[PDB]
Amino acid sequence: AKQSMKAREVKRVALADKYFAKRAELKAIISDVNAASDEDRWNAVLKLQTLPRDSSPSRQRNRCRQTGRPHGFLRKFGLSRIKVREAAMRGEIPGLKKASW
Amino acid sequence: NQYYGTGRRKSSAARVFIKPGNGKIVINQRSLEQYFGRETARMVVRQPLELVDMVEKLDLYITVKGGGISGQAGAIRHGITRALMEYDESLRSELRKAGFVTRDARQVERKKVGLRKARRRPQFSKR
Amino acid sequence: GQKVHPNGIRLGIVKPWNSTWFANTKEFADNLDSDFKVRQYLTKELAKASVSRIVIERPAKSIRVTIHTARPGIVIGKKGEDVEKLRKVVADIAGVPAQINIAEVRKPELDAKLVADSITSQLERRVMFRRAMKRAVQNAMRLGAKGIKVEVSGRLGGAEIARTEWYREGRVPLHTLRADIDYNTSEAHTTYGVIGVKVWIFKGEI
Amino acid sequence: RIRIRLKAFDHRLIDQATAEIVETAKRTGAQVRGPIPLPTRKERFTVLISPHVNKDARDQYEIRTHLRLVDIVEPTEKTVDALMRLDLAAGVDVQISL
Amino acid sequence: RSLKKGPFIDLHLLKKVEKAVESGDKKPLRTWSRRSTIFPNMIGLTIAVHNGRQHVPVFVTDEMVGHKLGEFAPTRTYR
Amino acid sequence: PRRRVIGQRKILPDPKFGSELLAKFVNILMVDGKKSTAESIVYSALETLAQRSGKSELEAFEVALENVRPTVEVKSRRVGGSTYQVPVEVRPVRRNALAMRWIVEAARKRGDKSMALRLANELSDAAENKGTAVKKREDVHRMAEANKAFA
Amino acid sequence: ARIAGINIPDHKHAVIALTSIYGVGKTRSKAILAAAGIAEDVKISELSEGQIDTLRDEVAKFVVEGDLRREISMSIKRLMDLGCYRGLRHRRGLPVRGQRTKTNARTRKGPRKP
RNA sequence: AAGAACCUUACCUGGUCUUGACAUCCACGGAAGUUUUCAGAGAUGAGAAUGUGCCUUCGGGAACCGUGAGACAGGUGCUGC
RNA sequence: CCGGCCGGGAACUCAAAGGAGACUGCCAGUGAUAAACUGGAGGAAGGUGGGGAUGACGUCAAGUCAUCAUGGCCCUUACGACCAGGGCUACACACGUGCUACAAUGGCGCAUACAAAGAGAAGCGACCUCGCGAGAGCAAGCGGACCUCAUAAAGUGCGUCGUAGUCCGGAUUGGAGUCUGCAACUCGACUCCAUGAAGUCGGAAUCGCUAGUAAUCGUGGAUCAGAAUGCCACGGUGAAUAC
């Protein structure tokens, strides 16, 4: 779905692993209640804009890994609601069969 | 000799013990009165004990979990009639005649897809 | 479209799964995408080698591909080198240990993917569709099948409107759950469009 | 001492995955409790069915994850290597506590 | 109704406010930050906030301090 | 239904004293599946009925039930395009179940203080037949005896 | 029985009586009686007249009944003078907190007249 | 739509880019990367720093990056008649 | 230290496996000695036990070329690519589907009983301390029948309210906040304090349901940083009626 959008997502995956989870402690350590609440903390909201607009994991849209369908997602499979259906009917997901209880 | 009958009713599950003795009833170490015998349908547990003789003839140790207020009460009534195995061919003719050993399953239905709760279709509009 | 997929309803009863491995919910998506990469690649390269199904089983952080093909003489090649030349590029996209395992089928007109590819390949090269449709019925019924229904859908002859034509012999019960039905589907990208072949094979009662 | 717990998606494949680990342990060693059935974590996935509208029609699936225990009591040295490189029954993932 | 610790501004607004005070109030500013508050040193400035297709100039008063810059720019024009 | 002629449910009798009849009167008065709050209306409407009457427990409720109990009712049987009200005799099962309903309709109207006080006043006004529930019954008998020319 | 500008009910409990004052509800009125020392189960007429002025210097601690009105009218007329988003919503008669205006918002808009 | 503050996002206004955000092939450069400054709303536009490896035909590998040339990529553009 | 808390127990609930059970099989009557039907017995269950999955040939040139794949046409320094702000949340209006109500079988306050099903690792987050509260600090445990989410709510006991737009209603709004996130103005949820709107059962009309159903009461999940009255699941109470 719009090959730009599939490549626009894999930028946000790698560039978030580059900055945050190492420089995501720039908000955790320093936007924190201590005796450094005036000078250092105001340098934490300063440098967290020095990082790019991306790399925040709130910009992950978490798309389907085959079609890039942004909607109907399932975290268990990494697929949209359609490709989880076409693969389960084919016998691709182990254990997943129709339930009637 | 102490006897036993299980009984269950609508996602509840009792296990009725029974001894010949005085006519007291212990349910989950509460009294029969203060557990739910101060509440409505207090005597569906005493319904098999009304038809065949209770008066001071045998006591009833009960523990029960699952279900709700009237769900556990039906589980005991089915548990007493299975605990009444001492005089089975003298009891379970007329005890069957009044019901009381039919488990009476009738679970809650599962919610169906498209339906609002298992029968209730949402509000059809023609136009 | 109103019928259930005949394989997916029978995955617990008679038909097995194409993939067999346990994985917890952390890696289950990553372990499913790797299963899709080794499958669309291995169907691209073994396009002329008549593959019906491939079985992806994964024990102990290691892959074990199992290729069910009608012509394994292409897949082993000379000496078993093309066995190895597939095993190199599977370990790039699966996780470093690997085995592939050929498993021949000796009656190729009873696998539903091979019968579908037999009709798909002929519809590519402008054969008449009713001739290809019915010749896969007659060749399968004499070879021991208790039923076959084949079905083509699409332009089929350079027609303006698309229409579906299907031809069946034998007994093919689809609502019976003990009924072992071989069902698979291919499509034939002609120059008038896409034509969709699908084929049921009733093999036995239980 | 040996806590063997093992889980899989299929009940008739986890049976002899548990029966053979009893046959491996109880024969050359001793003192296994047995298969303890440990209720299945059924996980349902309700997804839509069409590539567009018709929210109403859906397919409902599940995975059933079966669980078992083994509970070998004593550190038998005939048994401590009966688990090593004798780990058959693929499709099953096994976890041990020491 | 937010943000317990640290009134929010973008740096390209802050590091431009410091330049517009000491050089003196000369000309309106082209800013794109509607998400930034109005620090008290911004009184007297003439910042123009991008409503989406314009930059409407808004001369900061003394009571426009707690609010944000985009609060004083209608993004949807209506009748 | 169309094919069925099916029977009815063995309801459970009243707990405090043996009556399958006013065990149905609880369920008619019961709204939203709250039975325990419906019973405490029914008992507290009976002792205040037994206070001013003297008839002991259910022999007071039985007198007040037969004065609202109808005998003939009308239902529209269409014959050949026409549509008119036809009187028919009520079945004896329906006969008092329709009587227990009309009390509850008369007792949910005429709101004085509380439902136990409301329903006790309608049982009392039915005993000497001057209330709303006997006003309902006479008009049902007014639907017959003028439109009794059809049978 | 006449603490601030109005407060005249009768045959009514003391906490429900104080809700008549513009500027005190149920939490503040339970704190007006907790600090003065009046049990909330008594009425106004039973409450002694020497204990009523104990309520008067207790309701002197909140902004009530005359000052709250022109502290609220002052802030709304303030916002309409900033020309903000919220000030324009008060000037047009539209919902302010960010509610739907396509279908609902008929409390703010008045009667559905046309 | 099993979930629009940014993202999603396809829309709008403005700011930029053209063998391109993503793919393959060729020729040249450069190990990949890591540290920060400055300008800008950012994209981008320069820097200043640091690192310079796994295999030797030693006109070279492979991995990745930059540049130019054309095949072409790209299209949530149209037709579900 | 009465907490299955502990020694010990494998009976019982339970948990998943493996089996038994229900077939008009027995009996009676009607029936063309047939199919079957009515009634009874035994039985946990009675005649497709309950519910679901399972959707015949085809119908509508039904829906989707914006999941994907695709014939043709068109763009290909642009209808492609990147970015910041904006919009999808606009609002004289009209309709659909919902939730909350209009109260006394009710509201509030105190006390107290009984669930099932799910989820959890950049996650679920006890105990303790602080804050009126949303929450914060600290720091165990748990990828789990054990650790957390998590106190079930209607119910019941006791007290008050006294039928008034009222102690009903919780709209709108002012102020002060919390949390997520780079960011909460456009445009988030929530908490506190104040505000106290329409509404007193609803025109013509019209919808759903026959049993653990309707109705009512809460709980969990998916998507998801946050953001449901929607959807999808779970158990509590529990009818009326079918001539």
Curated annotation (Swiss-Prot), chain A:
Molecular function GO terms recorded? rRNA binding; structural constituent of ribosome; tRNA binding
Q: Name one Pfam family in it.
A: Ribosomal_S14
Q: Which UniProt keywords apply?
A: Ribonucleoprotein, Ribosomal protein
Q: Which GO terms describe its biological process?
A: cytoplasmic translation; ribosomal small subunit assembly; translation
Which InterPro entries does UniProt cross-reference here? Ribosomal_uS14, Ribosomal_uS14_bac/plastid, Ribosomal_uS14_CS
- Cellular component GO terms, alphabetically? cytoplasm; cytosolic small ribosomal subunit; small ribosomal subunit
UniProt xrefs under PROSITE patterns: RIBOSOMAL_S14 (PS00527)
Q: What family is reported?
A: Belongs to the universal ribosomal protein uS14 family.
- PANTHER family recorded for this chain? 30S RIBOSOMAL PROTEIN S14, SMALL RIBOSOMAL SUBUNIT PROTEIN US14M
The task this protein performs is described as: Binds 16S rRNA, required for the assembly of 30S particles and may also be responsible for determining the conformation of the 16S rRNA at the A site.
Q: Quaternary structure per UniProt?
A: Part of the 30S ribosomal subunit. Contacts proteins S3 and S10.
Query: What name does this protein carry?
Result: Small ribosomal subunit protein uS14
- Organism of origin is Escherichia coli (strain K12)
Curated annotation (Swiss-Prot), chain C:
GO molecular function ontology, one term from the record:
structural constituent of ribosome
CDD domains associated with the record = KH-II_30S_S3
The record's section on SUPFAM superfamilies has: Prokaryotic type KH domain (KH-domain type II) (SSF54814), Ribosomal protein S3 C-terminal domain (SSF54821)
One GO CC term on file: cytoplasm
- Would you say which domain of life the source belongs to? Bacteria
What SMART domains would the database entry show?
KH
Keyword set for this entry? Ribonucleoprotein, Ribosomal protein, RNA-binding, rRNA-binding
What Pfam families does the record point to? KH_2, Ribosomal_S3_C
- Which terms does the UniProt entry file under GO BP? cytoplasmic translation; ribosomal small subunit assembly
Q: What sequence ranges are listed for the domain KH type-2?
A: 38-106
Disulfide bond sites:
none
Any keyword Signal? no
Quick check: keyword rRNA-binding in the entry?
A: yes
Family listed: Belongs to the universal ribosomal protein uS3 family.
Q: List the HAMAP family.
A: Ribosomal_uS3_B
Quaternary organization: Part of the 30S ribosomal subunit. Forms a tight complex with proteins uS10 and uS14. With proteins uS4 and uS5 encircles the mRNA as it enters the ribosome, which may play a role in mRNA helicase processivity. Some nascent polypeptide chains are able to cross-link to this protein in situ. In collided ribosomes contacts ribosome rescue factor SmrB.
The record's function comment reads:
Binds the lower part of the 30S subunit head. Binds mRNA in the 70S ribosome, positioning it for translation. Plays a role in mRNA unwinding by the ribosome, possibly by forming part of a processivity clamp.
Name assigned to this protein: Small ribosomal subunit protein uS3
Curated annotation (Swiss-Prot), chain E:
Q: Name the Gene Ontology biological process terms.
A: cytoplasmic translation; ribosomal small subunit assembly
GO CC annotations, alphabetized: cytoplasm; cytosol; cytosolic small ribosomal subunit
Keywords on record = Ribonucleoprotein, Ribosomal protein, RNA-binding, rRNA-binding, tRNA-binding
Entry-linked InterPro entries:
Ribosomal_uS19, Ribosomal_uS19_bac-type, Ribosomal_uS19_CS, Ribosomal_uS19_SF
Q: Does the record bear Mitochondrion in its keywords?
A: no
This protein's record includes keyword tRNA-binding:
yes
The highest taxon in the source lineage is Bacteria
Which GO molecular function annotations are given, in alphabetical order? rRNA binding; structural constituent of ribosome; tRNA binding
All disulfide bonds of the chain are none
The subunit field of the Swiss-Prot or TrEMBL record says:
Part of the 30S ribosomal subunit. Binds S13 and L5 and cross-links to the A site tRNA.
Family in the record: Belongs to the universal ribosomal protein uS19 family.
Protein's job? In the E.coli 70S ribosome in the initiation state it has been modeled to contact the 23S rRNA of the 50S subunit forming part of bridge B1a; this bridge is broken in the model with bound EF-G. The 23S rRNA contact site in bridge B1a is modeled to differ in different ribosomal states, contacting alternately S13 or S19. In the 3.5 angstroms resolved ribosome structures the contacts between L5, S13 and S19 bridge B1b are different, confirming the dynamic nature of this interaction. Bridge B1a is not visible in the crystallized ribosomes due to 23S rRNA disorder. Protein S19 forms a complex with S13 that binds strongly to the 16S ribosomal RNA. Contacts the A site tRNA.
Recorded protein name is Small ribosomal subunit protein uS19
Which species does this protein come from? Escherichia coli (strain K12)
UniProtKB/Swiss-Prot annotation, chain F:
Q: Which domain of life is it from?
A: Bacteria
Q: Which residues form the signal peptide?
A: none
GO MF annotation terms: mRNA binding; rRNA binding; structural constituent of ribosome; tRNA binding
Query: GO CC terms on record?
Result: cytoplasm; cytosol; cytosolic small ribosomal subunit; membrane; ribosome
| Keyword RNA-binding on entry | yes
Q: Which UniProt keywords apply?
A: Ribonucleoprotein, Ribosomal protein, RNA-binding, rRNA-binding, tRNA-binding
Q: Is the Transport keyword given for this protein? A: no
Q: Which terms under GO biological process does the entry name?
A: cytoplasmic translation; negative regulation of translation; ribosomal small subunit assembly; translation
Q: What does this protein do?
A: One of the primary rRNA binding proteins, it binds directly to 16S rRNA where it nucleates assembly of the head domain of the 30S subunit. Is located at the subunit interface close to the decoding center, where it has been shown to contact mRNA. Has been shown to contact tRNA in both the P and E sites; it probably blocks exit of the E site tRNA. Protein S7 is also a translational repressor protein; it regulates the expression of the str operon members to different degrees by binding to its mRNA.
Q: What else is known?
A: The strain K12 sequence is shown. Has been predicted to contact the N-terminal domain of IF-3 based on footprint studies; exactly how IF-3 interacts with the 30S subunit is controversial.
Q: Which family does it belong to?
A: Belongs to the universal ribosomal protein uS7 family.
The subunit field of the Swiss-Prot or TrEMBL record says: Part of the 30S ribosomal subunit. Contacts proteins S9 and S11. Cross-links to IF3 and the P and E site tRNAs.
Name of this chain's protein:
Small ribosomal subunit protein uS7
Tell me the gene name.
rpsG
